[PDB]
Amino acid sequence: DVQQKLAELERQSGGRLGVALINTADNSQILYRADERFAMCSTSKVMAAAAVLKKSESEPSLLNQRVEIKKSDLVNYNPIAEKHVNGTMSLAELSAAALQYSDNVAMNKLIAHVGGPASVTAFARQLGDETFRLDRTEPTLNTAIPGDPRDTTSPRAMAQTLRNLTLGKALGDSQRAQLVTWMKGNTTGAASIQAGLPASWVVGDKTGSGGYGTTNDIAVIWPKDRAPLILVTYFTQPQPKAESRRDILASAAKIVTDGL
């Protein structure tokens, strides 16, 4: 069955796998280690962008607000921000860069705007997510040390929250649409969940990676002529310098969606 297949995949992988699928056709879930904590890495960029979107509901000019980019802002991975040093980007542009290119400067600007990691966490709490915690900024939030609860969530909580953000009523209508538009335009996810789904299915996702070979993806999925799915696949490994294993996420996605 699906549980045995996931256990076998985990055994083969040598690491620790967390999966939560919500099928909105029948309001069912497929769960594997879904209440364990995993380091989110860049999948936390969804919550930061959503916090800024929430703020924009009562401040219509917010997405146009200009943010200075300086050499002092650069971190480890800055594919968009590095092109704008000594200029500004709007908060909309930073949100897009964080979500679609995983730009770390962009993430730090979103975090700073709303008040820091504790404010992103407070936003999660306001949504009814009592598991999520964003502790640190970029680049340190990705250390992913085993047993460290900083910058973690559970697959169950993240799937439920992503459902709320993308398909539910956490955000106003325009803001929900904007988050969905941004995630559907992600450029970084083709090797992860998407690689385990049929080519025709439409996906909005956010990947992340970090220490201990941590390899993650969270997605909203519109299968051909079906109600949408939400899928979280988190994976981490025992060795500090383990390599990424996006193939494991793809395999997990194939296993949990084959019964469709």
- Residue 139: asked if its preceding bond is cis (omega within 30°), the reply is yes
Among residues 153, 220, 211, which one has the least CA distance to residue 18?
153
CB atoms within 10 A of CB 91: 23
- Which residues are CB-neighbours of 8 under 8 A, at least 6 positions away? none
Are 203 and 213 within 8 A, CB to CB? Answer: no
Residue for token pair 């996702």:
205
Among residues 201, 197, 168, 206, which one has the least CA distance to residue 255?
197
CA distance 118 to 136: 9
The H or E element that residue 66 is part of is strand 66-68
Tokens representing residue 37 in the block: 């904590």
CB atoms within 10 A of CB 56: 22
Tokens representing residue 103 in the block: 């730009």
Identity at 150, one-letter amino acid code: R
Identity at 28, one-letter amino acid code: S
Are 226 and 198 within 8 A, CB to CB? Answer: no
* Catalytic residue numbers, as ranges: 42
Hey, what domains does the chain have and what are their CATH numbers? 1-260 (3.40.710.10)
